[PDB]
């Protein structure tokens, strides 16, 4: 899944 700081 995407890293914590995605979006």
């Amino acid at each position, epitope marked *: *899944e*995407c*890293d*914590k*700081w*995605c979006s």
Partner: antibody, heavy 132, light 108 residues
């Protein structure tokens, strides 16, 4: 100045449980968005990412080792602990913990996420040998 | 999972050379990529974060560029302390992968 240092047993026997402690200074695991991760390096091999934990307590693990790893933090003692169960010889490696910055804030407002893209300060590493 | 391939795996050079190491990802990682230099017996040291930002206290001969799936680290004027192994690390997707490393040694 941020510094981290790993501690635990240098020798461990197969099937046993390995508990590694990362004690640090210069930051708090209560600071905004900060992370502390663990990376290992078998002798002569490449770095391998293991897990990371953030100050808001989100935890993430390497999918290949997920079932054997537990990472936890003790904010008031400035320590992060990684517990690996059922070790075997292939787990012999030098284990490093490392700091990960949280986003830069301006008057407590997140304005830059570029600084989270790296593990910026590392501990010297602790050598662990798994043999019966 | 996501694959990070470094090239070349090994590279020979001399003091004063310009070298460039490249790292390619199997899926785009935006700019979430870091470069490290690791000298024998020591922990890796952060050189470049967020694909191109120079880490504080790191000498200016180190430079990083690229985004998406292709990144490069170039050391413009190799110094003796640069004979070492370099690694790239992706931080866009979990797990936060490392490349295989590229060893830079004294050419002869």
């Amino acid at each position: 100045r941020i510094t981290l240092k790993e501690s635990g047993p240098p020798l461990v026997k197969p099937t046993q449980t390995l508990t590694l402690t990362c004690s640090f200074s210069g930051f708090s695991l209560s600071d905004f968005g900060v992370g502390v991760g663990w990376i290992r390096q078998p002798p002569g091999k490449a770095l391998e990412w293991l897990a990371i934990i953030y100050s808001d307590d989100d935890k993430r693990y390497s999918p290949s080792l997920n079932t054997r790893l537990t990472i936890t933090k003790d904010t008031s003692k400035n320590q992060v602990v990684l517990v690996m169960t059922r070790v075997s010889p292939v787990d012999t490696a030098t284990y490093f913990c490392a700091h990960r910055r949280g986003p830069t804030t301006l008057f407590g407002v997140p304005i830059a996420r570029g600084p989270v893209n790296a593990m910026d300060v590392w501990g010297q590493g602790i050598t662990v040998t798994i043999s019966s | 999972a996501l694959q990070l391939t470094q090239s070349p795996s090994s590279l020979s050079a001399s003091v004063g050379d310009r070298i460039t190491i490249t790292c390619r990802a199997s899926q785009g990682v935006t700019s979430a990529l870091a470069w490290y230099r690791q000298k024998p017996g020591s922990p890796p040291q952060l050189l470049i974060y967020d694909a191109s930002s120079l880490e504080s206290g790191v000498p200016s001969r180190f430079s990083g560029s690229g985004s998406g799936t292709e990144f490069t680290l170039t050391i413009s004027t190799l110094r003796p302390e640069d004979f070492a192994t370099y690694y790239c690390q992706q931080l866009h997707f979990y797990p936060h992968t490392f490349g295989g490393g590229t060893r830079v040694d004294v050419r002869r």
